[PDB]
Design a binder for this molecule. Structure first.
Ligand SMILES: Cc1nc(NC(=O)N2CCC[C@H]2C(N)=O)sc1-c1ccnc(C(C)(C)C(F)(F)F)c1
Length: 835
């Protein structure tokens, strides 16, 4: 076929695993997933082609927008009576002559008004990248115009006739592949499950078991007798304290061959995606030794079986009811389940506490009793759920009248419900139902790294989170682009390869034309991915890389595609001269691309990117996104702390891409230390003289107050002279993040004086440093939720809550607002010896 086979090899390249290899998968829980049940995502395509070509265009080019419509008061003061001056680079002649035009327009206007003033047949293109002003959003909402107003930059916006884009987007529609087309509450018996034997036991060995719903034990942890290692003929019908109807929906039984150190752990759902209590013999390969865990079991893991079949396999014999028993529908459960001194104040004391606050059982019973009032205060839902034992049918039934009827909570609050705890299929249903309705495309863009890692927390392959993420990826090629590259990064993990290959190929069938560009991205990456592996010492390196991009096969894949950091950055022919290799630890690729846009000179004549291959960049993105929200809740309250949360994307295993800031000058190891202690201020002064000397100092403090407290609140690592850089408008920021939660700058704030503490400018630096954590400690629930969502990300730092206790220490969440003022002051006056 010319429509089925046209796509099934492009897909095999854009995932790296042939669709044939997943056609031959014998596991019954893949074919049911891939069938038309997910292919209702074609409705997403129906959404993206509803009103052609405007709907198609808004799909293909996603606006980059700020989540804050109303411009803040200080940014409003950054404007001349709330007015921005923008240059319009009209092109009319067929030649290269450009007719520019300058306009003074109210910052609350719209691209339609810009079109009307400059002169609907035209669209505004950001001059130097394929950023397009298309939909009816205010000018100041776009990140380009908002950043222009913030930095006082001169905004550049060329005019292009719409036909130059409407006719530049060939259509590519959706063709389906060949695969297009008792009750557990009436039994009376304890949980009685047999261990047969282990096929590949490794050298009194016993199976330690237990029922878990979360990290919470659901009964006594039944064990086996101590058989000899040679012949593990267990054959034991272990009797669990858990009565079978009491088994909850997500109650994966946890095996542990234990020599009480677990030789091998493994989770197995006590249900399945069709709500069937697993029966019959089951030979499952067990997962390797727990990663940094000395627990009695390892419920911190994935359900199902191990794809690697060389691991010790244990044989099990589940319940034999001589029939099939199904978990009741939610209607039957719901039918089954069918004051101001502290009953209103203690509740608010709980709600305002972080989810990491260990709720006492004496207070868990208080939370449990006031179900009828905790429903009125929404932000307590993450804590009411933990106030319920999953040992019981009646307890969980009582909750299912609450979390199903719970009024929706704010999206950053509903993102905690998708962690390792809260593993109920309906808790995550509520979390995703809130995340769909309230989360916006740029907040989703920030939080997508979190949402990808919580696919692994839902127990079946056809989640509702999968549906949400796929539908969003089929409407913007930023959710699509970054979702695709997140999954491609997490393909190399065998644990989630089965999920993520199917998810990827579900996306590669309905993304559209972008797949080719996506392939051209992947191809362009896999040469660089190859190139780095070829590379794994500079002049030979420089000439080798020049030779390796001058070849026609290499130069073909490395030209005319889009940046994996920004598809709006239309990469053209490589600037062969300005591409080099650093003398760094992993030797990343400094790569420069000329802009095929006619007028490259406005934003940037050339596009610069760092290509790291060897270091994980999920923690780097985690730091940069925490920085982004911290800035957005500092620069929305009027505390004009200035910083740069820039682009970062890990494209595979420990391989990724970083947008170079060319404005930010050399590292301070040379820009300040010259690879004397007065170099930084002198260099900043000689590069900024006159009446402009205010901001170049004024924005330095606001660029050092917000990063001394960010490196504090999140416990970020050491700040060497090779880790910090500085712009020329006084801005500085940190670039080499990574692992965390584990004076030259002083004289600049005092404007060159060798004595700084006595100065008033140092005092204002302190008084904005304090206001920095005044609101960050007011917004701690968001940060705790975000940190908690990355526990199963595989990051070596976020393994358990014992590491998120570090941010608890740094923010001191237990103390009162007045008492927390001196908490930072102690370490702050310890760092610089007085303040
Ligand atoms: C965001 C960003 N902007 C840069 N800017 C220049 O390097 N510039 C700016 C122009 C000249 C050049 C220079 N020598 O000054 S670097 C950088 C960055 C971000 C993250 N990690 C790194 C490295 C180099 C430490 C790593 F780890 F990748 F090797 C760099």
């Amino acid at each position: 076929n010319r429509e089925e086979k046209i796509l099934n090899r492009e897909i095999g390249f854009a995932i790296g695993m042939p669709v044939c290899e997943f056609d031959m998968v014998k596991d019954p829980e893949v074919q049911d997933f891939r069938r038309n049940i997910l292919n209702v995502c074609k409705e997403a395509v129906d959404l993206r082609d509803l009103n052609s070509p405007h709907s198609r265009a808004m799909y293909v080019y996603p606006p980059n927008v700020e989540s804050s419509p109303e411009l803040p008061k200080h940014i409003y003061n950054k404007l001349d009576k709330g007015q921005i001056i923008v240059v319009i680079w009209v092109i009319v002649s067929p030649n290269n002559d450009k007719q520019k035009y300058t306009l003074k327009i109210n910052h609350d206007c719209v691209p339609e008004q810009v079109i009307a003033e400059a002169i609907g047949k035209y669209i505004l293109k950001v001059c130097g990248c394929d950023e397009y002003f298309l939909e009816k959003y205010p000018l100041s909402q776009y990140k380009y115009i908002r950043s222009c107003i913030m930095l006082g930059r001169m905004p550049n916006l060329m005019l292009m006739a719409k036909e130059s884009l409407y006719s530049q987007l060939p259509m590519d529609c959706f063709t389906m592949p060949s695969y297009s087309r008792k009750s557990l509450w009436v039994i009376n018996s304890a949980l009685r499950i047999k261990i047969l034997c282990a096929t590949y036991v490794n050298v009194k060995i016993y199976v330690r078991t237990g029922i878990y719903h979360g990290g919470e034990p659901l009964c006594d942890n039944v064990n086996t007798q101590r058989v000899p290692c040679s012949n593990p003929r267990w054959n034991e019908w272990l009797n669990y304290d858990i009565y079978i109807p009491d088994l909850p929906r997500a109650a994966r039984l946890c095996l542990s061959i234990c020599s009480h150190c677990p030789l091998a752990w493994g989770n197995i759902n006590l249900f399945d995606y069709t709500d069937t209590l697993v029966s019959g013999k089951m030979a499952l390969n067990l997962w390797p030794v727990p990663h940094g865990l000395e627990d009695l079991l390892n419920p911190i893991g994935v359900t199902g079986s191990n794809p690697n079949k060389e691991t010790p396999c244990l044989e099990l014999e589940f319940d034999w009811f001589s029939s099939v028993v199904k978990f009741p529908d939610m209607s039957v459960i719901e039918e089954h389940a069918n004051l101001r001194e502290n009953d209103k104040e203690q509740l608010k004391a709980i709600s305002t506490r972080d989810p990491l606050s260990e709720i006492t059982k004496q207070e868990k019973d208080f939370l449990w009793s006031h179900r009828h009032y905790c429903v009125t205060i929404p932000e307590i839902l993450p804590k009411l759920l933990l106030s319920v034992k999953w040992n019981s049918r009646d307890e969980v039934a009582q909750m299912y009248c609450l979390v199903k009827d719970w009024p929706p909570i704010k999206p950053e609050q509903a993102m905690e419900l998708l962690d390792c705890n809260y593993p109920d299929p309906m808790v995550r249903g509520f979390a995703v139902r809130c995340l769909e309705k309230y989360l916006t495309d740029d907040k989703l863009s920030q939080y997508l790294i979190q949402l990808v890692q919580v696919l692994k927390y839902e127990q079946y392959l056809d989640n509702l989170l999968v549906r949400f993420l796929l539908k969003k990826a089929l409407t913007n090629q930023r959710i699509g682009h970054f979702f695709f590259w997140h999954l491609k990064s997490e393909m190399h993990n065998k644990t989630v390869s089965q999920r993520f290959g199917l998810l990827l190929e579900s996306y590669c069938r309905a993304c559209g034309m972008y797949l080719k560009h996506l392939n051209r991205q992947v191809e362009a990456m896999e040469k660089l991915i190859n190139l780095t592996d070829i590379l794994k010492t500079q002049k030979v390196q420089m000439k080798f890389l020049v030779e390796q991009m001058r070849r026609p096969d290499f130069m073909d894949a490395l030209q005319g595609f889009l940046s994996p950091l920004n598809p709006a950055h239309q990469l053209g022919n490589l600037r062969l001269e300005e591409c080099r290799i650093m003398s760094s630890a992993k030797r990343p690729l400094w790569l420069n691309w000329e802009n095929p846009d006619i007028m490259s000179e406005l934003l940037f004549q050339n596009n610069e990117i760092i290509f790291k291959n060897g270091d994980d960049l999920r923690q780097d993105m985690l730091t940069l996104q925490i920085i982004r929200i911290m800035e957005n809740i500092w620069q929305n309250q009027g505390l004009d702390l200035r910083m740069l949360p820039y682009g970062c994307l890990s494209i595979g295993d420990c391989v990724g891409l970083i947008e170079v800031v060319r404005n930010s000058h050399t590292i301070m190891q040379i820009q300040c230390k010259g690879g004397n202690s007065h170099t930084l201020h002198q260099w900043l002064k000689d590069k900024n003289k006159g009446e402009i000397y205010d901001a170049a100092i004024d924005l330095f403090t606001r660029s050092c107050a917000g990063y001394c407290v960010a490196t504090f609140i999140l416990g970020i690592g050491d700040r060497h002279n090779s880790n910090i850089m500085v712009k020329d408008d006084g801005q500085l920021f940190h670039i080499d993040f990574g692992h965390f939660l584990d004076q030259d700058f002083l004289i600049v704030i005092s404007k060159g004086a060798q004595e700084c503490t006595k100065t008033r400018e140092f005092e204002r630096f302190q008084e904005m440093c304090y206001k920095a954590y005044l609101a960050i400690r007011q917004h701690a629930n968001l940060f705790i939720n975000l940190f908690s969502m990355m526990l199963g990300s595989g990051m070596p730092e976020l393994q358990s809550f014992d590491d998120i206790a570090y941010i608890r220490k740094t923010l001191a969440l237990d103390k009162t607002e007045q008492e927390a003022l001196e908490y930072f002051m102690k370490q702050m006056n310890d760092a610089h010896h007085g303040g």
